Amino acid sequence: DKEWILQKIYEIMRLLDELGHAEASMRVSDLIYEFMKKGDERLLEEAERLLEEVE
Amino acid sequence: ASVYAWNRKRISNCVADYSVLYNSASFSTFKCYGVSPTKLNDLCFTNVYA
């Protein structure tokens, strides 16, 4: 499951760059770094929430 | 039980082995929020309610 979560967060920041919202992308990237060091899956929920605010 | 009037089972004063349910292939989904799903056998809770 962790592998899919990392892929989803990665795709979210990639999209945020494409959408022209670099600050949101930067914030999501930070979620990736923290995620790769932890078992905390709520970082996905934050990546998704940030994307929803942008879209 | 129905979703409107759900049941609550009290889990207390025991060993809670979560490896059976974690490894079981009979379940379609699992998600933990405040805890890591792989640390459940290291953790201890005041009481557990199912």
Side-chain angles (χ1 to χ4, degrees), chain A residues 20 22 24 39 47, chain B residues 1 5-11 14-16 18 20-21 25 32 34 37 43-46 48-50:
Chain B
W6 44 272
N7 289 333
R8 173 166 283 183
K9 172 69 173 178
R10 180 170 60 86
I11 299 167
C14 65
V15 175
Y18 297 90
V20 173
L21 63 88
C32 298
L43 296 169
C44 186
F45 309 113
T46 300
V48 176
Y49 295 93

